[PDB]
Amino acid sequence: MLVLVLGDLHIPHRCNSLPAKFKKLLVPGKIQHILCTGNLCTKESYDYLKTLAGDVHIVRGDFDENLNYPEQKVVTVGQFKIGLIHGHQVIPWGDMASLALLQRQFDVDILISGHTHKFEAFEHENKFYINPGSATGAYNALETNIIPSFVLMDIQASTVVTYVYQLIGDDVKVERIEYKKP
Amino acid sequence: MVEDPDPEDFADEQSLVGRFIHLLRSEDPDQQYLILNTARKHFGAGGNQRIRFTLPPLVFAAYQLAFRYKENSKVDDKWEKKCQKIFSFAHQTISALIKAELAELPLRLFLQGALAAGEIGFENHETVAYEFMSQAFSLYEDEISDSKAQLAAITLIIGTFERMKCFSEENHEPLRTQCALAASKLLKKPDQGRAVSTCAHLFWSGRNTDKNGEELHGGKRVMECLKKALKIANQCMDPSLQVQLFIEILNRYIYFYEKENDAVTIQVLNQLIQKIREDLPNLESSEETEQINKHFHNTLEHLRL
């Protein structure tokens, strides 16, 4: 079971499209679930996610038009209970202690969040945290060099293999991170 | 919604402006500024429905251009003057959205402008940042009434202000206490409790320019915020929601404890955990009640490790 984790597209506030090489990698048929942190800013982008899979989960970003996206969501995929929030509600933004406090409330094995525009994955107190960054490498006042990035989770069995794609220079670089639930 | 506009009606406008900005990002900064002004005029003639979509990209393009000027800081000796002009352009452009009777969007665009200005640090950037924050707070007070929208906006304001490091104490303290006041004056009690505790972070991890860029670390004032949030939580009546808020406030007390706030004592933690132990079993069994027990459980687990 492979889950696409992306967000912070900011089309068209800050960008016009995904990078050509990312569009290429993202192919219908293979993705089962999409977990999106928000800030696509347009339904056009939502329809595009729908073509890649038929189980799309999205949460409300601070600049999303649609007031019908939920503020947070818990999706259970296989054996994993996954929390999903944009991250503008987590204060200070990106802070790990703050992020963990929310894990305690949600009671989730993995917590996905966004907003910072910086890819991040890490384990803390026996729980896993993922931030896929911005799939378009959108502008962000607090970080001058933004790397387009998104995440693919592969798993069936109490184990997580997250492939992180990043557009460095003009080429895609992948990195593999493994997490197993205690 | 038949009464509401269909976004698919402005998809082309949106595609256009995105294609426009992408091609503009090739050109030289000095030209980019010119073409942005020309764009403002061209798109300004679309009227109130379309400027909603065509103008925010130009605002974001401007912030971006300002950071471009800063990286050219050694080559170009006028970069600060050009930044000044750019935030002026942003202010005007956002102000046109207000004229078109929008509030939520312009508020967020002003916050983004404040952040940007705070970071770039051109001459007079503190004044520009203060102005942008002030404009956001105006729109908050005047135009946002729905209790949900208020909570959202105030959290965004607090969150934005918390990351800013550009204000002197003489500008920082007014903003702090304006946040605290607005938070306490939200309509619903739960929203009030949450927003007030959220404010604690401003007294702690907020940075002014007086301490050489160090955090305020005002542990005393943190306690006062959480004390206020607790008072608000007692006045709640709904038993589930009250116990929820106790747990939330506790985790916030812990947060500042483990960040080495000396004003958070183990006594205070103990009083609040004890209160929760008592009230928690008196809840009606449900999905929601299991979730509250689990949250408390998780909090206690964390206290041990």
Residue numbers in the entry:
A (entry chain A): 1 to 182
B (entry chain C): 475 to 779
Quote from the publication.
The retromer complex (RC) controls the cellular localization and homeostasis of hundreds of transmembrane proteins, being involved in their recycling from early and maturing endosomes either to the trans-Golgi network (TGN) or back to the plasma membrane.
Such binding site seems to be incompatible with the stabilization of the VPS35/VPS29 interface, being mostly located on VPS35 and involving only transiently VPS29.
